[model samples]
Target: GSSGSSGTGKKPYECIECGKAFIQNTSLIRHWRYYHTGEKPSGPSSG
Candidate 1:
């Protein structure tokens, strides 16, 4: 049986639309940016 979701290593990040998964946060961030380029910037939050 397969261990990791993609058979790569380990599941790390999740997608909001298709519910797909990624092995890294940076990968997820890049995907989100491409799919959500017209949206407002997340920006920093106040402490």
Candidate 2:
């Protein structure tokens, strides 16, 4: 199986300011939310 991991290339080594290089778009988004907000996002937050 491909593991569907979208290899690290073209999706690795990126910037937090603009969000670049990432085959997994969700990963980029997760980075932004985790870094900027300083809190883990559970999608809109249930509490």
Candidate 3:
């Protein structure tokens, strides 16, 4: 009867390399580009 509540939050994006899930496409793309593709220069500056 309360099945809808259990699926309130969902992450459709999944990484093929490690099976990691992301809440949004941006996060998934960043993860794939950074870890899988080995391109870290496109991300924002944190340091």
Off by over 4 Å in 1: 1-10, 38-47
Candidate 3 segments exceeding 4 Å error? 1-10, 39-47
Candidates, ranked, TM-score: 3, 1, 2
- TM-score of each predicted structure versus truth: 0.45, 0.36, 0.53
> Which stretches of candidate 2 lie above 4 Å from their native place?
1-13, 16-21, 40-47
lDDT of 3 by residue, 2-41 (tens): 5533343456897766766788889899887776678664
* Alpha carbon lDDT of each predicted model: 0.64, 0.55, 0.69
**Per-residue lDDT of candidate 1, residues 1-47 (tens digit):** 65644445447798765465788889988767765553554543322
What is the lDDT ranking, best to worst? 3, 1, 2
lDDT per residue (tens digit) for residues 1-47 in model 2: 45555555454456556545555667767666675565653345221
Clashing pairs in 1: none
Model 1: C-alpha RMSD to truth?
10.3
